[PDB]
Amino acid sequence: FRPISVFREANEDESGFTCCAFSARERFLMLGTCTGQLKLYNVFSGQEEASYNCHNSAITHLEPSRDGSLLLTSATWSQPLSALWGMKSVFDMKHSFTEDHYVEFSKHSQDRVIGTKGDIAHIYDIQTGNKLLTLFNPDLANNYKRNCATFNPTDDLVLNDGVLWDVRSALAIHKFDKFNMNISGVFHPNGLEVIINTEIWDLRTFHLLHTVPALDQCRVVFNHTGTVMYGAMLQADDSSFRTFNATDYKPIATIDVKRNIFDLCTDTKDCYLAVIENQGSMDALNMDTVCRLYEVG
Ligand SMILES: Fc1ccccc1C1=Cc2ccccc2C2=NCCN12
Ligand SMILES: Fc1ccccc1C1=Cc2ccccc2C2=NCCN12
Ligand SMILES: Fc1ccccc1C1=Cc2ccccc2C2=NCCN12
Known part of the structure; x- marks a missing residue:
């Protein structure tokens, strides 16, 4: 991991970056802040290019659409808690998701949003903002304290609360047993496996393929090709980022950056890893984060 850049928040005695993602214009990173600002930075020069107030509480999460026309945000104690913003021409609010603590785009065609409210997943039409679908069954629930529904x-x-659902029928196919209190899990990009904390399950059989103890409590991100997997413990759930070969799950690296981690993300070309680190302790009067960019390839 070769360091390529470092940069804080401009003109802030206390740098309050909390999350990050690559924009559709490579060279530029979008960051959320502890004051609910969305900022655009040149990821090499550290230059702040634009700023908008999305929320009156901290940003926990953001996701740009691929086509560069939309942005999802989630805050901490705001009503509404999550929103969808338009970025074509002018920056403006399209829809709000009143009590959803987390939201993502669909993956193959980006025409829907999926939101989470405690144990309950909500699917929404992007163009109308309607709720199409509520996925929740009280007799299959795991009650994951960090439950994040995902396509x-x-x-x-x-996957919602450790339950696999079939969207076309709105039927629960399978509930994976509970083995931790917090993490509800993600799909592998290959379409064949699910990662729920330290368990990797096959979607053919529901048989355990791998135990990866090092993944305990970790959020997980993939490079674009789906061949490398990164994991870390995140602040929004509460210094070691791990990397794994995504086919066999054997470790490639264990970095200790010496600093509690707020977020990590990949570019579309498998070239870069961007990480938000705090230089402060948690017991400090104030936050002091940096964004670090690493060459990987
Ligand atoms: F949005 C959240 C609200 C509460 C707890 C965690 C998250 C969250 C989930 C996540 C999943 C995969 C990759 C990155 C992330 C992430 N980055 C910042 C915080 N966060
Ligand atoms: F304001 C922003 C806040 C956060 C992220 C991006 C922007 C932004 C920067 C921009 C730069 C040059 C030309 C047009 C634009 C623009 N039009 C709408 C969105 N947007
Ligand atoms: F295996 C099952 C037994 C009973 C019910 C469903 C399945 C199943 C779910 C699935 C989900 C995503 C990708 C592939 C699959 C799959 N491939 C074969 C079987 N199967």
Whole structure:
């Protein structure tokens, strides 16, 4: 991991970056802040290019659409808690998701949003903002304290609270047992496997393929090709980022950056990893984060 850039928040005695993602214009990173600002930075020069107030509480999460026309945000204690913003021409609010603490785009065709409210997943039409679908069954719930509902790559399955759902029928196919209190899990990009904390399950059989103890409590991100997997413990859930070969799950690196981690993300070309680190302790009067960019390839 070769350091390529470092940069804080401009003109802030206390730098308050909390999350990050690559924009559709490579060279430029979008960051959320502890004051609910969305900022655009040149990721090499550290130059702040634009700023908008999205929320009156901290940003926890953001996701740009691929086509560069839309942005999803989630805040901490704001009503509404999550929103969808338009970025074509002018920056403006399209829809709000009143109590959803987390939101993502669909994957294969980006025409829907999936939101989470405690144990319950909500699917929404992007163009109308309607709720199309509520996925919740009280007799299959795991009650994961960090539950984050997510589409599979083809947009026809959802994982919510450790339960696999088939969208077209709105039927629960399978409930994976509970083995931790917090983490509800993600689809592998290959479409064949699910990662729920330290368990990797096959979607053919529901048989355990791998135990990866090092993944305990970790959020997970993939490079664009789906061949490398990064994991870290995140602040929004509460210094070691791990990297794994995404086919066999054997470790490639264990970095200790010496600093608690707020977020990590990949570019579309498998070239860069961007990480938000705090230089402060948690017991400090104030936050002091940096964004670090690493060459990987
Ligand atoms: F949005 C959240 C609200 C509460 C707890 C965690 C998250 C969250 C989930 C996530 C999943 C995969 C990759 C990155 C992330 C992430 N980055 C910042 C915080 N965050
Ligand atoms: F304001 C922003 C806040 C956060 C992220 C991006 C922007 C932004 C920067 C921009 C730069 C040059 C030309 C047009 C634009 C623009 N039009 C709408 C969105 N947007
Ligand atoms: F295996 C099952 C037994 C009973 C019910 C469903 C399945 C199943 C779910 C699935 C989900 C995503 C990708 C592939 C699959 C799959 N491939 C074969 C079987 N199968």
